[PDB]
Design a protein around this ligand. Structure first.
Ligand code: HEM
Length: 154
């Protein structure tokens, strides 16, 4: 797939808002993922002991990991599709070391869209959401193709 420049502008316009508070957005997204799809929490040996949302909010570690996740995603979205290099190490660690199924990347995509819709209603109308969804679908498709080449079924 290929996004048009207008779709990338809608994605990077909302992302510039997210970047005003990377840690707050990373925390909301990862918690949203774990609350919605609790099975994803089992993949993190680091955080699986966390039992409640209050414990998740109070974990500095979790907040630090959310920042790492959004910084890496931000770096990929700012390439506007030319992200082949950035994707290689990410696909290798998530397919070989962590073993993350593509279905879980769909679940976090849903969590990113939920949180942006909830924090940025004015910059995340239907067209901007469609463009973000297209950008994350592109990301998932390119990662799934890499998973294949690496020998891991998504
Ligand atoms: C937007 C999609 C995601 C991005 C950009 C992302 C990014 C990262 C980055 C940059 C790291 C540290 C370096 C590395 O190990 O590769 C990492 C580690 C990790 N990721 Fe992801 N990730 C994503 C989705 C997921 C999902 C959906 C899961 C699980 C359901 C997951 C599980 C993990 C685990 C288990 C680690 C190691 C955590 C720790 O022990 O430090 N990732 N991720």
């Amino acid at each position: 797939m290929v996004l048009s420049e207008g779709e990338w502008q809608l994605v990077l316009h909302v992302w510039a808002k997210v970047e005003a508070d990377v840690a707050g957005h990373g925390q909301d997204i990862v918690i949203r993922l774990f609350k919605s799809h609790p099975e994803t929490l089992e993949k993190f040996d680091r955080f699986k002991h966390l039992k409640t949302e209050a414990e998740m909010k109070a974990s500095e570690d979790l907040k630090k990991h959310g920042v790492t996740v959004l910084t890496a995603l931000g770096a990929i979205l700012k390439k506007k599709g030319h992200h082949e290099a950035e994707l290689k190490p990410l696909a290798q660690s998530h397919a070989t070391k962590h073993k993350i199924p593509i279905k879980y990347l769909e679940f976090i995509s849903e969590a990113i869209i939920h949180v942006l819709h909830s924090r940025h209603p004015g910059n995340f109308g239907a067209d901007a959401q469609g463009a973000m969804n297209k950008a994350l679908e592109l990301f998932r498709k390119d990662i799934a193709a890499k998973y294949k080449e690496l020998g891991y079924q998504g």
